[model samples]
Target: MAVNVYSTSVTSDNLSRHDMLAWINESLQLNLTKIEQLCSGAAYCQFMDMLFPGSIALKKVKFQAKLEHEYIQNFKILQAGFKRMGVDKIIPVDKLVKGKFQDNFEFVQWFKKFFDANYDGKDYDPVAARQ
Candidate 1:
């Protein structure tokens, strides 16, 4: 459906961060008031986990949160996940880790498109994801 997910013009203005954040909360079941919350990459990995079961090793995912060190840990795992899924999107993870509005918005918008592009209208076990 989202055939243009890889377009170079897919900037932050291409999509609303609020809508993307709503989708993020809906899909991942989070209460994030700001897009900056995504910097943690913990929830982002869970989305990847849904995209490909077992792609993310959630041995400690649902926790170990809300710290600077955790960002490196979780985002590193997420970069590995993009490799596993064969998605060529570069994370610009260093920028995202800063929690800046612009870069975060761009990444979230692209991720929203990515989710729609790959989602198969199937179900995933969210309750069981707390491993």
Candidate 2:
């Protein structure tokens, strides 16, 4: 037997916030809590691009910098509201990550501590874990 994983063909530049929110709530089928636990900045950025597709260009590694409690919480709350009530304009991604903008790596390190302590069973794997 063989296992196959199908990846999404949608790119950040072409995704729509409305569609992304609908797709997530439908496809992932996970509640907000579980989603928060397993979510990553890369994944969130992909969706955010749909809303404000061309506001700025960011490196893929830069996506990791947005994975923090405040950011994630705001994302979750705003997305839910945005899904229910349509928005007039796209907000800049810069605003979303503004507080965490000191330095990418530093933000990651700082957020990791909070995340590690908050989540119960699983520990957050920092960049070192990649190696």
Candidate 3:
């Protein structure tokens, strides 16, 4: 076996919003009660940045993105980050922006799969990225 890199989806792991919050908040040190909170894609961009430092301009991610287009901006940046990281998976920004449960949940689970494979536990100043 070549270690299955990211093929296991934890389908039985039941990645509900509570599980999602535990993992994401523990990793990013933020408070998220709802998975839909990731609709802005700011945390997604930061997760990539955390995995591949300097890959995404952390300052460019918006924490208080109030509008749909603003959310789109962060997602565009995340798409660019995906490009840089060679994660060819298409990000469903439209479905994501609707702030629904399933869309973000699936995306978050995939991201967690990716994160597990890539995270190195090296020094990353997440606080420096809250811009």
Candidate 4:
């Protein structure tokens, strides 16, 4: 039998916030069971450390949630509800450089380094990671 291997750890060096968010999206395929395997227990703790850092000491049992209905549909509704509740503080960042390869390429490199420095690596606990 072939087993699927998933990663619970992330490389903090040379990291980008966009990349991390993309990783999260990839991991959360609306399948909580598989998510647990990659994100629960120790993996969750390490994940928290990657984002929050040093606040959470010791690992805890994984919390699993179930959604019977279509998750995408429900999420859209939930997002709309939250938008109504908010004051519209969320805004997209304007691109640093508008046009031209030289301007854009350097801008991307600078931004990438900025994000990577912000999220340095933390201890990875493979023992508590499920699967």
lDDT of 2 by residue, 47-114 (tens): 33333332213233243334565455544543443344333223333444444332333323322332
| Tens digit per residue, CA lDDT, model 1, 1-131 | 12346775443445566777777777767678899888888878888788777777877563447776778788888878788777778888888877888888878877877877777776876657864
lDDT of every predicted structure (CA atoms): 0.75, 0.34, 0.80, 0.32
TM-score attained by model 4:
0.24
- Tens digits of per-residue lDDT, candidate 3, 1-131, equal 01123444443354667887898788778888889989989888888888888788778888778788989999999888887777757889999988998898988887777777677888766777784
lDDT assessment of candidate 1: 0.75
RMSD (CA, angstroms), candidate 4: 15.1
Output the number of the TM-score-best candidate: 3
TM-score for each predicted model, relative to the true structure: 0.84, 0.23, 0.86, 0.24
Total clashing pairs in model 3: 0
Query: Which regions of candidate 3 are displaced past 4 Å?
Result: 1-14
- RMSD (Cα, Å) for all candidates, in order, is 3.2, 16.8, 3.3, 15.1
Question: Alpha carbon lDDT of residue 74, candidate 2?
Answer: 44
Ranking by lDDT: 3, 1, 2, 4
lDDT of 2 at 87: 34
Pitting candidate 2 against candidate 3, the one with the higher lDDT is: 3
C-alpha lDDT of residue 71 in model 4: 26
